[PDB]
Every structure is written in C-alpha cells, then in structure tokens.
Amino acid sequence: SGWQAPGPNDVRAPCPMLNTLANHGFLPHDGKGITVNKTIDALGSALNIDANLSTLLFGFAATTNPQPNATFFDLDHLSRHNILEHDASLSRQDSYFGPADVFNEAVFNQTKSFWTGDIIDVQMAANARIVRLLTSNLTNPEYSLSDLGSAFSIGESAAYIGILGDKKSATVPKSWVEYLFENERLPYELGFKRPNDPFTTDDLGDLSTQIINAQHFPQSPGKVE
Numbered sequence: 001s002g003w004q005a006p007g008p009n010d011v012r013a014p015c016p017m018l019n020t021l022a023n024h025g026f027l028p029h030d031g032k033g034i035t036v037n038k039t040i041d042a043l044g045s046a047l048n049i050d051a052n053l054s055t056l057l058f059g060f061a062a063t064t065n066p067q068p069n070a071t072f073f074d075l076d077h078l079s080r081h082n083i084l085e086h087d088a089s090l091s092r093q094d095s096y097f098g099p100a101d102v103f104n105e106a107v108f109n110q111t112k113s114f115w116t117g118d119i120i121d122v123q124m125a126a127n128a129r130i131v132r133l134l135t136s137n138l139t140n141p142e143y144s145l146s147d148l149g150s151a152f153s154i155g156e157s158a159a160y161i162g163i164l165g166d167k168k169s170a171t172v173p174k175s176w177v178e179y180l181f182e183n184e185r186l187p188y189e190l191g192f193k194r195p196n197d198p199f200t201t202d203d204l205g206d207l208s209t210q211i212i213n214a215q216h217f218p219q220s221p222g223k224v225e
C-alpha cells in the first residue's frame with residue numbers, strides 16, 4: 001500500500017527523490033512520459049514544491065530527452081552523463097567507474113561518514129559534498145564538473161535539507177536522509193510530513209548560498225562554487 005519497487009520494464013534516474021516519487025506513484029511508476037503538468041502535480045502533491053520551481057526543474061529535465069525540444073522526459077534520460085548527471089554524487093559512482101544511476105554503497109558510506117550527528121546541518125551537508133568533489137578529482141582521471149553540474153551539486157545538498165527537513169533552521173534528521181537514499185521511499189514512519197509552506201526557487205537559492213558560505217578552503221581546488 002503506497003509504494004512498489006520498480007520492475008524489469010520501469011526506468012529510474014540518478015535522482016533519489018524522483019525515483020522515490022515514481023516508487024510511490026506521484027510520478028508514473030514506470031518512470032516514463034513525464035510532462036510539465038505531471039511534474040508540477042507530483043512535486044506539489046508529495047513535497048509542496050511550488051509550480052515555478054517545478055517548471056524550472058522540468059525545463060532542465062526535458063534537455064536530457066534525446067528527442068530535441070521535447071515536452072516530456074523519462075527518468076533514465078536524466079542518467080545521461082554530463083547533461084544534468086555529474087561526477088562527485090553523494091550516493092552514485094562517477095560514470096567513469098560504472099553506472100552513475102543506481103545507489104552505490106561505497107560512495108554513500110563516504111557521504112554518511114561526514115554526517116556526524118543525528119541532525120544534519122548546513123555545515124555537515126557542505127562538508128560531505130566537498131569531500132566528494134575532492135575524492136572524485138583525485139580518483140577519476142575523467143573527472144569533470146560543468147557550471148551547470150556545480151549548480152546542481154550545490155542545489156542537491158540544499159534540496160535534501162530544505163525539502164525533506166526544515167528550511168528555516170536549515171536542518172534535517174540524518175535518519176530521514178539515509179532512509180530516502182537507501183530505500184527510495186519517503187520516511188513518513190520516521191517522522192517526515194509534507195510541509196504546509198511551499199518550497200520555492202528563492203528557498204533553494206537561500207540554502208545554496210548557505211552551503212557555499214559553509215565552505216572554508218584556504219585556497220579552492222577547482223570547481224567548488
């Protein structure tokens with residue numbers, strides 16, 4: 001009741017949240033044929049994402065469809081390397097090593113080790129992302145991070161805090177974030193509840209700026225902001 005794993009003809013993304021929303025049936029369970037209206041309704045219904053932010057994200061998503069000027073995308077279109085998908089993901093390996101769409105325990109064990117308390121704050125989120133960037137640069141001879149990929153990286157850490165947790169305190173319970181990643185299911189039973197206030201483009205930008213301000217390199221090595 002309310003959740004089904006994907007089956008052999010379903011497609012999934014490198015996005016733990018869209019995967020979770022397909023598993024629940026907010027998005028089509030097969031991951032296919034997602035339009036702007038399905039995106040607005042799904043992200044609104046499940047998470048209280050506002051329409052303008054949903055439309056922005058949809059605009060990016062549609063660029064991954066191999067069909068030009070497409071009005072839909074499928075979740076596996078999002079896995080195409082270096083369109084939106086990028087190196088130094090928190091829970092996916094880099095494309096160079098292996099498929100960059102599915103959960104990777106080794107990678108997620110690294111991320112988790114930088115979430116040092118029961119409550120994730122901006123500092124811990126920023127620190128986990130940093131070590132992923134540096135690790136990929138020092139281990140992946142094809143490491144790359146485009147301007148768009150860097151903006152995505154920073155906004156994905158902002159998103160788990162502000163969409164799953166409390167955008168005002170900029171904190172989220174660690175257990176909730178680990179449950180989302182490890183299960184691709186919303187952690188309702190751990191306490192998650194859809195927020196009453198919409199999550200906006202400005203909310204995402206505000207948390208993204210917080211993430212960057214929590215970075216304290218003596219000297220920045222490559223693309224970090």
Ligand code: HEM
Pocket residue numbers: 014015016017018039043047049057058060061078079084085086087088089090091092152156157159160163164
């Ligand atoms: C239409 C909406 C969305 C699109 C098009 C989208 C797209 C993507 C893509 C392409 C990635 C992979 C980037 C990479 O290589 O790591 C990703 C990662 C991610 N997304 Fe989404 N996303 C959407 C909505 C959301 C929402 C609503 C959340 C809320 C929590 C979210 C949280 C994340 C997180 C946390 C990651 C990072 C995964 C990792 O680093 O392992 N996304 N998303």
Ligand SMILES: *[C@@H]1O[C@H](CO)[C@@H](O)[C@H](O)[C@H]1NC(C)=O
Pocket residue numbers: 105106109
């Ligand atoms: C991830 O950590 C778990 C928990 O300590 C461990 O059992 C597992 O072997 C680790 N996986 C990798 C590939 O490091």
Ligand SMILES: *[C@@H]1O[C@H](CO)[C@@H](O)[C@H](O)[C@H]1NC(C)=O
Pocket residue numbers: 137143144145221222223224
């Ligand atoms: C990887 O590290 C090098 C050496 O600091 C840096 O010049 C480069 O910009 C980094 N690559 C990315 C994509 O950040």
Ligand SMILES: c1ccc(-n2ccnc2)cc1
Pocket residue numbers: 015057060151152153154155156159
């Ligand atoms: C710009 C910045 C971040 C994102 N994003 C957030 C979570 N998944 C994708 C999408 C566009």
Ligand SMILES: [Mg+2]
Pocket residue numbers: 014085086087088089092093094100
């Ligand atoms: Mg990636």
